[PDB]
Amino acid sequence: MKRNILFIPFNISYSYIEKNNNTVKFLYLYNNDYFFSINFNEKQSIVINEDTNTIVVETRNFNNKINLFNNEFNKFIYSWDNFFFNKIKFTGKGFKWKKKETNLFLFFNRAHKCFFIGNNIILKRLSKSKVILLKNNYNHLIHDSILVRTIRSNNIFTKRGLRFSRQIILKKKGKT
Amino acid sequence: KXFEREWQKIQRETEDKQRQALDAELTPAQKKRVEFIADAFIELNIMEIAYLNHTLKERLIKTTGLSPLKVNIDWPSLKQLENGSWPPANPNWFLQQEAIAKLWP
Amino acid sequence: GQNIAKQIFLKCKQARPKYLQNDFNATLVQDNEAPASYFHAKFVNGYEQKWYLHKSTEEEINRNLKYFNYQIEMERNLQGHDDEYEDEETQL
């Protein structure tokens, strides 16, 4: 059986509670700032390790949604006192940007304006051809990072244009 | 002959192949083994304690077996066993205690 | 907790040196005095930990390593370091 794994960070400390009746089982996460609880059915059995801050699950109910239950649970906790990050690049001749207080100005051979404006993000320039975004939610980040990508993306003939710093890149010959 | 039959239970019942570290502690299993030996060594007339001390120095020089734990060929002190068997044999031994008996004060 | 550490020691040396640091030295010691067999480790930017192995798995360990390796990027990229690989190293 697939025995899914629940990570817990190190800043977090947790407890596990049951009734005398033993018909209810739930779990309690608690940090300096936040606190969060969630239960387990009578058909979900559980194993814990303080050695790793990992928890293991079996499901007699055979529900396939749990694989999504993990990623929410895992990332929702690492969303406490930690960022998510991402990096963007470009390579080209008549390309540039300018950065002013989470307001990024893009000039990539287009007649129209191309301002990027970040609501509740962090943006810090490391070089002319590189910029990092930082935010606590991963899902807003990609929506924030990809808008930059859609202005210019990698040509399949030359790796000229913008791209993420970790991605599948395509290439195709041209003008041998 | 009733001893051989009884003995083979207790070694079986204490076959515990767990790896060990030689320490002061011992398993409750091993204690059933030791306690059965002492129950047999206590209830023996003195003509027999004489004999057992003679058996060992016929069995220890034979030393069929190598180990740093048990009896061992490379055990150093085996060669003396042929000479001395009982300290009551050495008449010098009889001098020591009466000599020491007067040295307590 | 023995055999789990056997396999890790191979992946530290049997593995490829490109994807390791240059000063990477893995060892093995028999410590009878320990409570349990352990996997001590040391990272670049200061981090250091130990993971006992009498109860765990090889999979529960890797997500801990990701919980460090994902952050060291967030630390070193801010310093300007490109800790990334060329695109031409592995195709599909």
């Binding site: 050695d51 006192d81 930690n82 | 398993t27 | 409570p35």
Partner: peptide
């Protein structure tokens, strides 16, 4: 003398910098 699971062995667990600190 044989494998008994320990009781009080857990080391410190490294604390990471918070975004305020960083």
């Amino acid at each position: 003398s044989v494998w008994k699971n320990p009781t009080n062995y857990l080391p410190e667990k490294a604390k990471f910098p918070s975004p305020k600190e960083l």
